[PDB]
Amino acid sequence: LPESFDAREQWPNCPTIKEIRDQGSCGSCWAFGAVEAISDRICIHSNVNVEVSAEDMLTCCGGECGDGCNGGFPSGAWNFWTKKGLVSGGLYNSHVGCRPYSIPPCEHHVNGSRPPCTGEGDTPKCSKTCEPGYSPSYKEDKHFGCSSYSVANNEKEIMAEIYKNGPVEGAFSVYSDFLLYKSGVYQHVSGEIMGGHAIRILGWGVENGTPYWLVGNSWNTDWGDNGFFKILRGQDHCGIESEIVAGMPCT
Ligand SMILES: *[C@]1(C(=O)N[C@H](C(=O)N[C@H](C(=O)O)[C@@H](C)CC)[C@@H](C)O)O[C@@H]1C(=O)OCC
Numbered sequence: 407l408p409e410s411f412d413a414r415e416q417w418p419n420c421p422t423i424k425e426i427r428d429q430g431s432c433g434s435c436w437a438f439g440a441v442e443a444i445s446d447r448i449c450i451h452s453n454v455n456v457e458v459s460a461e462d463m464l465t466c467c468g469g470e471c472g473d474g475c476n477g478g479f480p481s482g483a484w485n486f487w488t489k490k491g492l493v494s495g496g497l498y499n500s501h502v503g504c505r506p507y508s509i510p511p512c513e514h515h516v517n518g519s520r521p522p523c524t525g526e527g528d529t530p531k532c533s534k535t536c537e538p539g540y541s542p543s544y545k546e547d548k549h550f551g552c553s554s555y556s557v558a559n560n561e562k563e564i565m566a567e568i569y570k571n572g573p574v575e576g577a578f579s580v581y582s583d584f585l586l587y588k589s590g591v592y593q594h595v596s597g598e599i600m601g602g603h604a605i606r607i608l609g610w611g612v613e614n615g616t617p618y619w620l621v622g623n624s625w626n627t628d629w630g631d632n633g634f635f636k637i638l639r640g641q642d643h644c645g646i647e648s649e650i651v652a653g654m655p656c657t
Contacts, residue, residue, distance in 0.1 A: 407562070407565050407566065407569060408569075409611070409612060410609070410610065410611035410612065411565070411568065411569060411609045411610055411611070412608070412609040412611070412620060413446065413568065413572060413573050413608040413609050413620075414608065414609070417446075417449070417450055417572070419449070419453065420446055420449035420450055420455070421455070422442070422445040422446050422449060422455070422456075422457065423446045423449075423572075423573060423608060425442070425445075425622075426622055426623070426624070426626065426627050426632070426633030426634065427442060427460065427497065427507075427624050427626075428497070428498070428507075428511035428512070428514075428624060428625065428626040429460070429509070429624040429625070430498070430507070430509030430510055430511060430512055430523070430527065431509065431510075431512055431523045431524045431525070431526065431527040432464070432474075432475035432509050432527035432528075432529070433474075433475050433476055433477045433527070434460065434464045434474065434475055434478075434509075434624075435603050435604040435605065435624055436471065436472060436477060436478035436479060436480050436482075436483055436577075436604040437460050437463040437464040437467075437471070437478060437483055438460050438604070438606075438624040439480060439483075439575035439576070439577070439604040439605050439606045439624070440463060440480060440483035440484060440487070440575050440604075440651075441458040441459065441460045441463050441483075441492065442458075442573070442575075442606045442622065442624070443572070443573045443574055443575045443606050443652065444458045444484070444487055444492065444549075444551065444653070444655075445457060445458040446572050446573045446606075446608070447571065447572045447573070447652075447653075447654065447655055448549060448655045450571070450572040451571070451572075451654060451655050452655060452657075456494050456503075456549060457494055457495060457496045457497075457502055457503050458492050458494065458495070458549065459492055459493050459494055459495025459503060459504060459505040459506075459507075460495065460507050461495050461505040461506065461507050461508055461530065462492050462493045462495060462504070462505050463483055463486060463487075463492060464529065464530070465529060465530050465531060465532040465533070466486075466490065466532035466534070467482065467483065467486040467490075468532070470482050470485060470486060471483050471485075471486055473529075474529025475527045475528060475529045476529070477601075477602070478604075480575050480576075480577060480604050480649060480651045481554065481556055481651045483575075483651075484551060484554035484555075484575070484651055484652065484653040485554045487549075487550065487551035487554065487653060488550060488551040488552060488553065488554045488653060490548070491548030491549055491550035491551075492548065492549055492550075493505055493536065493544055493547040493548055493549070494547055494549070495507065497511075498510055498511055501537060501539075503536075503537075503540065503547075504536035504537065504540055504544060504547045505533070505536060505537065505544075506537060508530045509527060509530070511626055512524070512626075513626075513628070514625035514626060514629045515585040515586065515625075515629060516628055516629050518628050520626075549655065550655070550656045551653045551654065551655055551656065552653075552654055552655065552656035552657075553653050553654045554651070554652075554653040555651070555652060555653060556649075556650065556651050557574060557650035557651065557652060558650075559642055559647050559648045559650075560647070561639065561640050561647060564607070564647060564650050565610060567650070567652060568607065568608070568609065568610075571652065571654065572608075572652075573606050573607060573608040573609075573622075574606075574607050574650050574651065574652040575604060575605070575606055575607075575650070575651050575652065576604070576605055576606075576607045576619075576621075576646060576647070576649055576650045576651075577602050577603060577604040577605065577645070577646075577648075577649040578602070578603060578605070578637065578643070578644040578645050578646040578648075578649075579594075579599060579601075579602060579603075579644045579645055580599070580600040580601060580602070580603040580644075581594050581596070581597040581598065581599055581600060581644070582596070582597030582598050582600060583595060583596050583597040584597070584600075585597075585600070587630050587631075587635050588630065588631065589630075589631050590613065590636065591613050591614075591616045591618040591636045591637065591638055592635055592636060592637045592638065593616075593637075593638050593643065594643065594644055604649075605621050605622065605623055605624070606621065606622040606624075607619050607620070607621050607622075607646075607650070608620050608621070608622055610639055611636075613636065616638065617638070617639040617640050618636040618637060618638060618639045619636065619637050619638075619639045619646060620634065620636060621634060621635050621636065621637060622634050623635055
């Protein structure tokens, strides 16, 4: 395996890999890390390009994935992709795809032109229909996964999975000092525990002798390093290597 790897550079024909979404004022990171990595993989393993709907995952999976905007289970999200499939759906107000995200973007621990994010956000309804004007139907727009698995808490196995099959979804414990991340390799030193946070791991590298994971957050582009961040790799730091999940698209 190479010393560094950036899925963005390795799969140039898959622009979703470079995208950063905004989960809005809703605890839907579990769903976002999933649809983001799924969008990347559909492109990687089908050379088709599709913005997988965070809305479809968030609203229609149900108990199998947890509790919507109240948090969920990453592995459960990939299961939904294989069982019910996922329709397309772009950013809030984009009118792209069957079911675009319905929760407005906001400022995540940063100042900006958008309204500040709030904790209170209700899970939207599971509507099995597409926005007006979009074709095909909701049912016909479903994209299915043909496998859903969990990668072991093993640095090398995780790197190999990304190297071969593309970005994966992971999760780590967020402490308050992470909220102010701007650059460099994040290492937890202080702050009260905020809770688990699901994200998308798309690569790895070494910065100033410090090995790290290249990660895409779902708090828009004005948070962190253009929406991305790097976190210590190899020591299951904050559990970053303890909850890796992925899957492969059908055909
Ligand atoms: C994962 C999750 O969504 N994380 C939360 C989050 O992103 N909070 C944002 C924020 O801090 O900007 C606000 C705007 C929404 C409440 C927090 C807990 O980090 O609860 C979600 C989940 O499914 O966790 C299990 C992996």
